[PDB]
Amino acid sequence: AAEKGFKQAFWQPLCQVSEELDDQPKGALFTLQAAASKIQKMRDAALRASIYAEINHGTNRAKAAVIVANHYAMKADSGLEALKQTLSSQEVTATATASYLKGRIDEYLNLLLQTKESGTSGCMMDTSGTNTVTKAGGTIGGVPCKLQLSPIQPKRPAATYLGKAGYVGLTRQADAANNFHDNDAECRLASGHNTNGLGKSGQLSAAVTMAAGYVTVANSQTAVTVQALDALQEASGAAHQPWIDAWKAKKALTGAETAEFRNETAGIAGKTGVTKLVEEALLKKKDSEASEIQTELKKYFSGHENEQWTAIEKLISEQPVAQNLVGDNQPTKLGELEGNAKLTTILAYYRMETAGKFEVLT
Amino acid sequence: AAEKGFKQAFWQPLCQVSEELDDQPKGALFTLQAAASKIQKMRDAALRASIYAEINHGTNRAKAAVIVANHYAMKADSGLEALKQTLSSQEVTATATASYLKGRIDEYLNLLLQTKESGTSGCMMDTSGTNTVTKAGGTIGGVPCKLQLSPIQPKRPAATYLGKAGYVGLTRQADAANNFHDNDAECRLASGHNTNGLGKSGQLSAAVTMAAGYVTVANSQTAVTVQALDALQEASGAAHQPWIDAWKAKKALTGAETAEFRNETAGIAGKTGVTKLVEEALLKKKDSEASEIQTELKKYFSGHENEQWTAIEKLISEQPVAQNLVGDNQPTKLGELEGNAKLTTILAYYRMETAGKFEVLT
Amino acid sequence: VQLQESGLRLSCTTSGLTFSNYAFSWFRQREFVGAISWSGGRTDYASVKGRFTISRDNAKNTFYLQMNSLDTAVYYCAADLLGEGSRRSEYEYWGQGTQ
Amino acid sequence: QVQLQESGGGLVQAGGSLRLSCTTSGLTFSNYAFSWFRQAREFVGAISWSGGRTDYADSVKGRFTISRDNAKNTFYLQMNSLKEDTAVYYCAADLLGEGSRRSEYEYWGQGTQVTV
Ligand SMILES: *[C@@H]1O[C@H](CO)[C@@H](O[C@@H]2O[C@H](CO)[C@@H](O[C@@H]3O[C@H](CO)[C@@H](O)[C@H](O[C@H]4O[C@H](CO)[C@@H](O)[C@H](O)[C@@H]4O)[C@@H]3O)[C@H](O)[C@H]2NC(C)=O)[C@H](O)[C@H]1NC(C)=O
Ligand SMILES: *[C@@H]1O[C@H](CO)[C@@H](O[C@@H]2O[C@H](CO)[C@@H](O[C@@H]3O[C@H](CO)[C@@H](O)[C@H](O)[C@@H]3O)[C@H](O)[C@H]2NC(C)=O)[C@H](O)[C@H]1NC(C)=O
Ligand code: NA
Ligand code: NA
């Protein structure tokens, strides 16, 4: 009935959204860290290839390793640019919009939870409208609802209740008076009229919206109405804008999965940086024919397919470094070493060795 | 008087906090981008020094440049690791906690704003308690108070209303009945009693807290009480925990200002990576005395003070690259080139040149 | 990520992508039309040289095809990470096309 | 800002043991080498950023040991055969350091008093 407390069919879908929004900051941390980790993996491979080249000057494979190093260094560079220019804003915006909307929802649900007169009469009722609900651990009446922002550890968020289309559980309501409102439970938050609702000496001067514009509480003796949020379109200035903003921000996320962060499997000539480097440093011409590039790649890689790139990478990974550059009895193969700062100083050592060779050769 | 609507002294400090929390995501984006930009500047300096060392192979100047390159590459490496491990978590946590708290505040303030019966009686009153206030633009009675999360663009972090000690404007209130509550304006949100407040047939079962535990609304005919939040300490499980969470997360921010992101002015031997590289690659010993390091640094830098490092960096910055490697009429001196990907492919060109010259000389 | 063609002057505006990291090309149907390098310092044109001009505006995340003396076909934009502006490149992203 | 916070000091009888801790906040602990100094200023001991190298002053070698717990952002000094050891003990951090008393330290704690 109009002007009565809210049964679980009304507020449980809000709890479901609030719980899922709680995971959005966890996904932001996950993606920002994944982007950095992938950049670091690209940098490690660039450094391994660079070290192989310094050690093996004099062979054609050393020049192949210069090409490999350039590829991975360009990937690391472009990944950092993507992290700066694109992912940081995506993940901050998703974190902020989701957390803000969650704050709006949680403040409203916490108000309903506390606005009760007895164990059978209040603003927040169970499914049947028998008992008022109470906070119990991380639930309200058994429904997961923490009404808190949880500590942030990296995790991929679910998209069950907020997905590409909108808020799946926030559908059009055909009979709020019977499906959302109880028959008996008293709740002044259910209307703006003065007899049973928020007005004191008379009705409120206008309808009141709550939960960032989701629920509209009329100033007369009639049931609430709700926004259908399950089929959203991009908009501005809406009365329920925070719902749109969180939906748009979550749907926009790519994760650390654009081309900068992923290795390539389409042959050597088409790999990032390769053709341009062959043209600029080996052919020394401004524009090349595909067959001219293949001829150069044959000299250094013995081919132009993924298998020849993998073979050079195996030579790089198998190459041992000087034992004094690592601990006693520690691994020496480049492929058994990782960490940007660690590999950086190993490259410096071999550059110093190269300097000593040229000092005599010249 | 108890149970009456709230004058501006009550809600204006909440608007001030809300508007400042709105800037936390902007500052997170600013800091994440600043960290990446500083890493990129370190990498550019590493790449310029690396290119100089390839061009000038076999010289003491080149060996100095290998030491410079190693220094800046280690800084770039460590900065990316700090961005991954420390800054990302700091900024996601500050963004989430601030935005969540802002949502809790804004849902409460928006409720007060709408709960009115006339231009003179309502929950949200002006400074004198004469008129209810209205929202126009991003202001409420002239107070900046958008009650929305603004679009996110980078903005340098600042702190005025939420600082190291807490929320400056949220002080102990010794006379809420006269300073917060009006004399006349009616507002059922000001008490839990049934005559003038939220109760219907009787008083609410307990006190109700609002705005994430900031204000306590009694179930009797008595004035609200508020938490003093201007001198916070770390706590867990508090009724006003979201306020503590946002304060702690903001206080924790270091920005892109730790040692990884800042250049050093403490002489050469103590510069990140330098003594270790001299020991490992030049002396080829595990331990060294300071005099042995100074002797090596004299050979390559002509000294061990900042001025000698700066002098090598000036030589590096003045070194031109081949005109074919830049656009028509574009600068060719290394110090006039910037951008990681741009310098990376120049380094690849000169590594190719070095490989070929090594073949010819041997 | 999305490349969205629009528009005679055609526009291709990206979303979810670091526009400045990518070279961009126009194709039509499948025939190559023109390409611009990631830095914007190089352009290459197919049948269309002297009638069409390709350009980029990094600040607007938009790549453009200015067509003069005209096709008929669907025109598609494509992105190539750090590419040199070549029709032979591997393109990581493509639009849906415009008539 | 970055904080290094020493704890565990106090009044201890000579010949016994005491554990000092240094816990960091706001810093990527795994990026830094850490050292103990003391002032009754002199070097006590150091651990490399990787944890693979430690160095102790002659006056404490064979009596004190040092370790790091990256997972807890904590750096330790285990003091044994306490004697001359009374001083304020300070922890200090050195970016990517090798564990050397000669390094430049970017961050310093406030100290903890040990009285033997
Ligand atoms: C993009 O691809 C490159 C190339 O694969 C990749 O770099 C490689 O990274 C791995 C580390 O993730 C390096 O080490 C290998 O790791 C795998 C998986 O742990 C191991 O199985 C390998 O061991 C084999 O090889 C060793 C050396 O040959 C042997 O000692 C061992 O017994 C095994 O036979 C190896 O440890 C690998 O060295 C690099 N490759 C290069 C060329 O640097 C890069 O990380 C990828 N990028 C991203 C973002 O994922
Ligand atoms: C840490 O310090 C180094 C060394 O100063 C910084 O690298 C340097 O960056 C500047 C640009 O910011 C380069 O300056 C150039 O100087 C000429 C004037 O002679 C001018 O024409 C250019 O426009 C530019 O200003 C300089 O070449 C470059 N030095 C080296 C050796 O690469 C580095 O950016 C600093 N790191 C951070 C994070 O600030
Ligand atoms: Na490509
Ligand atoms: Na240092």
Short mmCIF file of N, CA and C in Angstrom, two decimals, chain A residues 25 29 33 36-37 39-40 50 57-58 63 67 70 73 77 80-81 84 89 92-93 96 99-100 103-104 106-107 110-111 114 116-118 147 149 186 188 195-205 208-212 280 282 284 325 340-341 344-345 348-349 351-353 355 358-359, chain B residues 25 29 33 36-37 39-40 50 58 63 67 70 73 77 80-81 84 89 92 96 99-100 103-104 106-107 110-111 114 116-117 147-149 152 186 188 195-202 204-205 208-212 277 280-282 284 325 340-341 344 348-349 351-354 358-359:
data_model
loop_
_atom_site.label_atom_id
_atom_site.label_comp_id
_atom_site.label_asym_id
_atom_site.label_seq_id
_atom_site.Cartn_x
_atom_site.Cartn_y
_atom_site.Cartn_z
N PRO A 25 36.90 -0.19 -7.67
CA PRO A 25 38.27 0.24 -7.33
C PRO A 25 39.25 -0.92 -7.34
N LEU A 29 42.81 -0.93 -9.51
CA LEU A 29 44.14 -1.30 -9.04
C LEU A 29 44.69 -2.47 -9.85
N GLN A 33 48.10 -1.93 -12.17
CA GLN A 33 49.26 -2.77 -11.87
C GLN A 33 49.58 -3.71 -13.02
N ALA A 36 51.52 -1.77 -15.73
CA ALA A 36 52.93 -1.60 -15.36
C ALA A 36 53.70 -2.92 -15.47
N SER A 37 53.10 -4.02 -15.01
CA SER A 37 53.78 -5.32 -15.09
C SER A 37 54.07 -5.70 -16.54
N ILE A 39 54.37 -3.60 -19.18
CA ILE A 39 55.46 -2.74 -19.63
C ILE A 39 56.81 -3.29 -19.15
N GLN A 40 56.87 -3.70 -17.88
CA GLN A 40 58.12 -4.21 -17.33
C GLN A 40 58.57 -5.48 -18.05
N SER A 50 69.15 -6.51 -25.94
CA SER A 50 70.24 -5.54 -26.01
C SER A 50 71.54 -6.15 -25.50
N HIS A 57 78.39 -8.94 -30.87
CA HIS A 57 78.85 -8.13 -31.99
C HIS A 57 79.82 -8.93 -32.85
N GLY A 58 79.60 -8.89 -34.16
CA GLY A 58 80.36 -9.68 -35.12
C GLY A 58 79.54 -10.74 -35.83
N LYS A 63 72.77 -8.46 -34.93
CA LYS A 63 71.92 -7.45 -35.54
C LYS A 63 70.44 -7.82 -35.45
N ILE A 67 67.21 -5.61 -33.60
CA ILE A 67 65.84 -5.45 -34.09
C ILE A 67 64.84 -5.92 -33.04
N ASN A 70 64.70 -3.34 -30.25
CA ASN A 70 63.96 -2.14 -30.64
C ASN A 70 62.47 -2.40 -30.56
N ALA A 73 61.47 -2.45 -26.85
CA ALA A 73 61.60 -1.13 -26.25
C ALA A 73 60.48 -0.21 -26.72
N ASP A 77 57.76 1.58 -24.36
CA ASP A 77 57.53 3.02 -24.43
C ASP A 77 56.06 3.32 -24.69
N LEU A 80 53.77 2.65 -21.66
CA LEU A 80 53.82 3.71 -20.66
C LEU A 80 53.02 4.93 -21.12
N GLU A 81 53.11 5.27 -22.41
CA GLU A 81 52.31 6.38 -22.92
C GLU A 81 50.81 6.07 -22.81
N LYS A 84 49.74 6.42 -19.21
CA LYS A 84 49.65 7.82 -18.82
C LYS A 84 48.42 8.48 -19.42
N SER A 89 43.24 7.71 -16.76
CA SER A 89 41.95 8.39 -16.70
C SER A 89 40.80 7.39 -16.67
N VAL A 92 40.78 5.87 -13.02
CA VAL A 92 40.36 6.85 -12.02
C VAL A 92 38.88 7.18 -12.18
N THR A 93 38.43 7.37 -13.43
CA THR A 93 37.04 7.73 -13.67
C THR A 93 36.09 6.61 -13.25
N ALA A 96 36.06 6.53 -9.37
CA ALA A 96 35.37 7.66 -8.76
C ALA A 96 33.86 7.58 -8.99
N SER A 99 32.39 4.60 -6.96
CA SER A 99 32.42 4.83 -5.52
C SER A 99 31.45 5.92 -5.11
N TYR A 100 31.33 6.97 -5.93
CA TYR A 100 30.39 8.05 -5.64
C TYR A 100 28.96 7.53 -5.66
N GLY A 103 28.28 5.51 -2.70
CA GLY A 103 28.02 6.35 -1.54
C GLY A 103 26.60 6.89 -1.52
N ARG A 104 26.08 7.30 -2.69
CA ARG A 104 24.71 7.79 -2.74
C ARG A 104 23.73 6.68 -2.37
N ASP A 106 24.37 3.84 -0.65
CA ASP A 106 24.56 3.35 0.71
C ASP A 106 23.99 4.31 1.74
N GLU A 107 24.07 5.62 1.49
CA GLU A 107 23.51 6.57 2.45
C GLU A 107 21.99 6.41 2.51
N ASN A 110 21.19 2.99 4.22
CA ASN A 110 21.45 3.09 5.65
C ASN A 110 20.39 3.91 6.36
N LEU A 111 19.82 4.91 5.68
CA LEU A 111 18.72 5.66 6.27
C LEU A 111 17.49 4.76 6.46
N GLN A 114 17.86 2.25 9.39
CA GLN A 114 17.75 2.77 10.74
C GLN A 114 16.38 3.33 11.08
N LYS A 116 13.13 2.79 11.76
CA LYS A 116 12.17 1.77 12.14
C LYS A 116 11.68 2.05 13.55
N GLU A 117 10.48 1.56 13.84
CA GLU A 117 9.90 1.69 15.16
C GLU A 117 9.85 0.39 15.94
N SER A 118 9.96 -0.76 15.28
CA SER A 118 9.82 -2.04 15.96
C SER A 118 10.37 -3.13 15.05
N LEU A 147 27.21 -1.92 3.01
CA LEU A 147 27.07 -0.47 3.17
C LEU A 147 28.39 0.16 3.60
N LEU A 149 32.64 0.78 1.91
CA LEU A 149 33.63 0.59 0.88
C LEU A 149 34.70 -0.33 1.47
N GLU A 186 5.11 1.09 8.90
CA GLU A 186 5.08 2.55 8.85
C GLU A 186 6.45 3.09 8.48
N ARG A 188 7.92 7.10 7.32
CA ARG A 188 7.71 8.45 6.83
C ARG A 188 8.56 8.78 5.61
N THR A 195 0.49 13.32 6.60
CA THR A 195 -0.17 12.38 7.49
C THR A 195 0.74 11.19 7.80
N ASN A 196 1.31 10.59 6.76
CA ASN A 196 2.11 9.38 6.89
C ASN A 196 3.55 9.55 6.44
N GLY A 197 3.91 10.71 5.88
CA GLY A 197 5.22 10.86 5.28
C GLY A 197 6.02 11.99 5.87
N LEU A 198 6.85 12.63 5.04
CA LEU A 198 7.89 13.53 5.53
C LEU A 198 7.38 14.91 5.90
N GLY A 199 6.24 15.33 5.37
CA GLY A 199 5.72 16.64 5.71
C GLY A 199 5.34 16.73 7.18
N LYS A 200 5.46 17.94 7.73
CA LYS A 200 5.09 18.18 9.12
C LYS A 200 3.73 18.87 9.19
N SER A 201 3.67 20.16 8.87
CA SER A 201 2.39 20.88 8.92
C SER A 201 1.59 20.74 7.64
N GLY A 202 2.23 20.35 6.54
CA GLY A 202 1.56 20.11 5.28
C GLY A 202 2.51 19.28 4.44
N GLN A 203 2.08 18.97 3.22
CA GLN A 203 2.91 18.18 2.33
C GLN A 203 4.18 18.95 1.94
N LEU A 204 5.22 18.20 1.59
CA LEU A 204 6.40 18.83 1.02
C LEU A 204 6.02 19.55 -0.27
N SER A 205 6.78 20.58 -0.62
CA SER A 205 6.36 21.41 -1.74
C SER A 205 6.52 20.72 -3.09
N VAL A 208 10.34 14.36 -3.97
CA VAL A 208 11.72 14.22 -3.52
C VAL A 208 12.30 12.98 -4.18
N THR A 209 13.46 13.12 -4.80
CA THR A 209 14.16 11.95 -5.32
C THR A 209 15.25 11.52 -4.36
N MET A 210 15.49 10.21 -4.31
CA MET A 210 16.50 9.64 -3.44
C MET A 210 17.32 8.60 -4.20
N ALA A 211 18.48 8.28 -3.64
CA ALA A 211 19.43 7.33 -4.23
C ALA A 211 19.88 7.81 -5.61
N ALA A 212 20.41 9.03 -5.62
CA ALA A 212 20.89 9.68 -6.84
C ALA A 212 19.85 9.63 -7.96
N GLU A 280 65.41 2.12 -42.33
CA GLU A 280 66.22 3.26 -41.92
C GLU A 280 67.67 2.88 -41.64
N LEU A 282 69.27 -0.43 -42.20
CA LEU A 282 69.92 -1.46 -43.00
C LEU A 282 69.86 -1.15 -44.49
N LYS A 284 68.72 1.75 -45.61
CA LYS A 284 69.00 3.19 -45.68
C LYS A 284 68.26 3.86 -46.84
N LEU A 325 78.32 -10.96 -12.22
CA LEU A 325 77.19 -10.04 -12.29
C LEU A 325 75.97 -10.54 -11.54
N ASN A 340 63.74 -5.04 -14.26
CA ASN A 340 64.29 -4.02 -15.14
C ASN A 340 65.60 -3.47 -14.60
N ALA A 341 65.61 -3.05 -13.34
CA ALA A 341 66.81 -2.44 -12.78
C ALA A 341 67.99 -3.41 -12.80
N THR A 344 69.18 -3.71 -16.42
CA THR A 344 69.78 -2.44 -16.83
C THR A 344 71.26 -2.38 -16.48
N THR A 345 71.63 -2.80 -15.27
CA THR A 345 73.05 -2.71 -14.89
C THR A 345 73.89 -3.75 -15.61
N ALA A 348 74.73 -2.18 -18.83
CA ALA A 348 75.80 -1.21 -18.63
C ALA A 348 77.16 -1.89 -18.61
N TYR A 349 77.26 -3.05 -17.94
CA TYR A 349 78.53 -3.77 -17.91
C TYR A 349 79.01 -4.11 -19.32
N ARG A 351 78.09 -2.76 -22.15
CA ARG A 351 78.42 -1.54 -22.88
C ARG A 351 79.82 -1.06 -22.54
N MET A 352 80.20 -1.15 -21.27
CA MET A 352 81.56 -0.81 -20.87
C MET A 352 82.57 -1.73 -21.56
N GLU A 353 82.24 -3.02 -21.66
CA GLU A 353 83.13 -3.95 -22.36
C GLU A 353 83.26 -3.56 -23.82
N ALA A 355 82.90 -0.57 -25.06
CA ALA A 355 83.74 0.62 -25.09
C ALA A 355 85.22 0.24 -25.06
N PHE A 358 86.29 -0.99 -28.63
CA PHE A 358 86.43 0.07 -29.61
C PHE A 358 87.61 0.96 -29.30
N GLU A 359 87.93 1.14 -28.01
CA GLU A 359 89.08 1.95 -27.64
C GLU A 359 90.35 1.44 -28.31
N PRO B 25 39.70 12.76 -7.21
CA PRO B 25 40.00 12.01 -8.44
C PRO B 25 40.82 12.82 -9.42
N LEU B 29 44.48 11.60 -10.87
CA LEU B 29 44.87 11.56 -12.27
C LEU B 29 46.12 12.41 -12.51
N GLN B 33 49.66 10.77 -13.85
CA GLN B 33 50.24 11.29 -15.09
C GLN B 33 51.60 11.93 -14.83
N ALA B 36 54.20 9.14 -14.56
CA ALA B 36 54.58 8.64 -15.87
C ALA B 36 55.44 9.65 -16.62
N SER B 37 55.08 10.94 -16.54
CA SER B 37 55.85 11.96 -17.24
C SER B 37 57.28 12.02 -16.73
N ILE B 39 58.97 9.53 -15.22
CA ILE B 39 59.63 8.33 -15.70
C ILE B 39 60.08 8.54 -17.13
N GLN B 40 59.20 9.13 -17.96
CA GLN B 40 59.55 9.35 -19.36
C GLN B 40 60.72 10.31 -19.51
N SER B 50 72.71 7.04 -23.93
CA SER B 50 73.00 5.81 -24.66
C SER B 50 73.37 6.10 -26.10
N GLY B 58 84.33 4.03 -27.83
CA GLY B 58 85.76 3.89 -27.62
C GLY B 58 86.44 5.07 -26.96
N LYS B 63 82.37 6.30 -22.10
CA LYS B 63 82.25 5.53 -20.86
C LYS B 63 81.54 6.34 -19.78
N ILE B 67 77.77 5.46 -17.92
CA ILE B 67 77.44 5.63 -16.50
C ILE B 67 76.22 6.52 -16.33
N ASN B 70 73.11 4.52 -17.43
CA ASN B 70 72.72 3.55 -16.43
C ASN B 70 71.99 4.22 -15.27
N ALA B 73 68.45 5.21 -16.52
CA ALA B 73 67.64 4.02 -16.77
C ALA B 73 67.20 3.38 -15.46
N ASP B 77 63.44 2.83 -14.32
CA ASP B 77 62.99 1.51 -13.88
C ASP B 77 62.36 1.58 -12.49
N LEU B 80 58.90 3.32 -12.43
CA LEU B 80 57.81 2.46 -12.89
C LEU B 80 57.43 1.45 -11.81
N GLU B 81 58.42 0.90 -11.10
CA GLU B 81 58.12 -0.02 -10.01
C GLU B 81 57.37 0.70 -8.88
N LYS B 84 53.83 1.22 -9.95
CA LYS B 84 53.07 -0.02 -9.85
C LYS B 84 52.73 -0.37 -8.41
N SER B 89 48.20 2.14 -5.86
CA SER B 89 47.33 1.83 -4.73
C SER B 89 46.97 3.08 -3.94
N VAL B 92 44.33 5.09 -6.17
CA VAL B 92 43.03 4.42 -6.25
C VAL B 92 42.32 4.49 -4.90
N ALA B 96 38.82 6.37 -4.30
CA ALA B 96 37.64 5.62 -3.89
C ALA B 96 37.09 6.12 -2.56
N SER B 99 35.57 9.64 -2.95
CA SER B 99 34.36 9.66 -3.77
C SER B 99 33.20 8.98 -3.04
N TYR B 100 33.50 7.90 -2.31
CA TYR B 100 32.48 7.22 -1.53
C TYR B 100 31.95 8.14 -0.43
N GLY B 103 29.77 10.76 -1.89
CA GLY B 103 28.43 10.25 -2.17
C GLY B 103 27.56 10.18 -0.93
N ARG B 104 28.14 9.74 0.20
CA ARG B 104 27.37 9.71 1.45
C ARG B 104 26.93 11.11 1.85
N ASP B 106 26.68 13.80 -0.10
CA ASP B 106 25.81 14.46 -1.07
C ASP B 106 24.40 13.91 -1.03
N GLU B 107 24.25 12.61 -0.77
CA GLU B 107 22.90 12.06 -0.66
C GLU B 107 22.18 12.66 0.54
N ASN B 110 21.41 16.43 -0.30
CA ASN B 110 20.35 16.52 -1.30
C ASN B 110 18.99 16.19 -0.69
N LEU B 111 18.97 15.31 0.32
CA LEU B 111 17.73 15.04 1.03
C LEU B 111 17.26 16.27 1.80
N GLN B 114 15.78 19.00 -0.51
CA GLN B 114 14.45 18.76 -1.08
C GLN B 114 13.36 18.67 -0.04
N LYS B 116 11.36 20.24 2.16
CA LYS B 116 10.87 21.54 2.58
C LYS B 116 9.38 21.64 2.27
N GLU B 117 8.69 22.49 3.02
CA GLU B 117 7.28 22.75 2.79
C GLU B 117 7.00 24.11 2.16
N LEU B 147 26.62 18.92 -5.40
CA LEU B 147 25.97 17.64 -5.11
C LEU B 147 26.06 16.66 -6.28
N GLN B 148 27.20 16.71 -6.97
CA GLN B 148 27.47 15.85 -8.10
C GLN B 148 28.97 15.66 -8.15
N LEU B 149 29.39 14.55 -8.74
CA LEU B 149 30.80 14.33 -9.05
C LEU B 149 31.08 14.96 -10.41
N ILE B 152 36.10 14.39 -14.70
CA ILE B 152 37.46 14.28 -14.18
C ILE B 152 38.45 14.75 -15.23
N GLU B 186 10.27 23.73 10.09
CA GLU B 186 9.93 22.35 10.41
C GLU B 186 10.73 21.38 9.54
N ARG B 188 11.27 17.00 9.62
CA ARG B 188 11.16 15.71 10.29
C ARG B 188 12.48 14.96 10.33
N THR B 195 6.35 13.20 17.18
CA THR B 195 5.57 14.44 17.08
C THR B 195 6.11 15.34 15.97
N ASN B 196 7.41 15.60 15.97
CA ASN B 196 8.02 16.50 15.01
C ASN B 196 9.05 15.84 14.11
N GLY B 197 9.28 14.53 14.25
CA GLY B 197 10.38 13.87 13.57
C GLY B 197 9.92 12.67 12.76
N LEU B 198 10.84 11.71 12.62
CA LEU B 198 10.64 10.61 11.68
C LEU B 198 9.68 9.54 12.16
N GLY B 199 9.42 9.43 13.46
CA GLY B 199 8.51 8.41 13.94
C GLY B 199 7.08 8.66 13.48
N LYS B 200 6.33 7.57 13.29
CA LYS B 200 4.93 7.69 12.90
C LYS B 200 4.02 7.47 14.10
N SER B 201 3.79 6.21 14.49
CA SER B 201 2.98 5.92 15.67
C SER B 201 3.75 6.08 16.97
N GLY B 202 5.07 6.02 16.93
CA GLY B 202 5.89 6.23 18.11
C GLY B 202 7.28 6.63 17.66
N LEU B 204 11.27 6.40 16.82
CA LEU B 204 12.14 5.38 16.24
C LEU B 204 12.79 4.57 17.36
N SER B 205 13.18 3.34 17.03
CA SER B 205 13.67 2.41 18.04
C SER B 205 14.99 2.87 18.65
N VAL B 208 19.43 7.64 15.02
CA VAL B 208 19.78 7.42 13.62
C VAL B 208 20.98 8.30 13.32
N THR B 209 22.00 7.74 12.67
CA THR B 209 23.10 8.58 12.20
C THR B 209 22.96 8.82 10.71
N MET B 210 23.43 9.99 10.28
CA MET B 210 23.37 10.37 8.87
C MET B 210 24.69 10.98 8.43
N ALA B 211 24.86 11.02 7.11
CA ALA B 211 26.11 11.47 6.48
C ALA B 211 27.30 10.66 6.98
N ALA B 212 27.24 9.35 6.75
CA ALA B 212 28.29 8.41 7.15
C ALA B 212 28.72 8.61 8.60
N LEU B 277 78.32 0.44 -10.49
CA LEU B 277 78.75 0.20 -11.87
C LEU B 277 80.25 0.35 -12.02
N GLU B 280 81.68 -2.82 -10.55
CA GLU B 280 81.39 -4.05 -11.28
C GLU B 280 82.04 -4.08 -12.66
N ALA B 281 81.99 -2.97 -13.38
CA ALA B 281 82.42 -2.96 -14.78
C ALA B 281 83.81 -2.40 -15.00
N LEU B 282 84.29 -1.52 -14.12
CA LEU B 282 85.59 -0.90 -14.32
C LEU B 282 86.66 -1.50 -13.43
N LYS B 284 86.06 -4.20 -11.56
CA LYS B 284 85.79 -5.63 -11.54
C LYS B 284 86.14 -6.25 -10.19
N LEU B 325 67.48 11.17 -39.71
CA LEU B 325 66.73 10.52 -38.65
C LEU B 325 65.63 11.39 -38.08
N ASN B 340 60.04 9.09 -25.77
CA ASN B 340 60.74 7.82 -25.60
C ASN B 340 60.80 7.05 -26.91
N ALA B 341 59.66 6.88 -27.57
CA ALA B 341 59.63 6.09 -28.80
C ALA B 341 60.52 6.70 -29.87
N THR B 344 64.14 6.00 -28.87
CA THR B 344 64.41 4.57 -28.92
C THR B 344 64.83 4.13 -30.32
N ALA B 348 68.35 2.55 -31.82
CA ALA B 348 68.43 1.35 -32.65
C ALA B 348 69.28 1.60 -33.90
N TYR B 349 69.11 2.77 -34.53
CA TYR B 349 69.92 3.09 -35.70
C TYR B 349 71.41 3.07 -35.36
N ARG B 351 72.90 1.64 -32.76
CA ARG B 351 73.34 0.28 -32.44
C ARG B 351 73.61 -0.51 -33.71
N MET B 352 72.77 -0.34 -34.74
CA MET B 352 73.04 -0.99 -36.01
C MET B 352 74.35 -0.50 -36.60
N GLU B 353 74.60 0.81 -36.51
CA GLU B 353 75.85 1.38 -37.01
C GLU B 353 77.04 0.79 -36.27
N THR B 354 76.93 0.67 -34.94
CA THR B 354 78.01 0.10 -34.14
C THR B 354 78.27 -1.35 -34.52
N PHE B 358 81.80 -2.57 -35.99
CA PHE B 358 82.54 -3.65 -35.33
C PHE B 358 82.92 -4.73 -36.34
N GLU B 359 81.99 -5.11 -37.21
CA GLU B 359 82.30 -6.11 -38.23
C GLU B 359 83.44 -5.64 -39.13
#
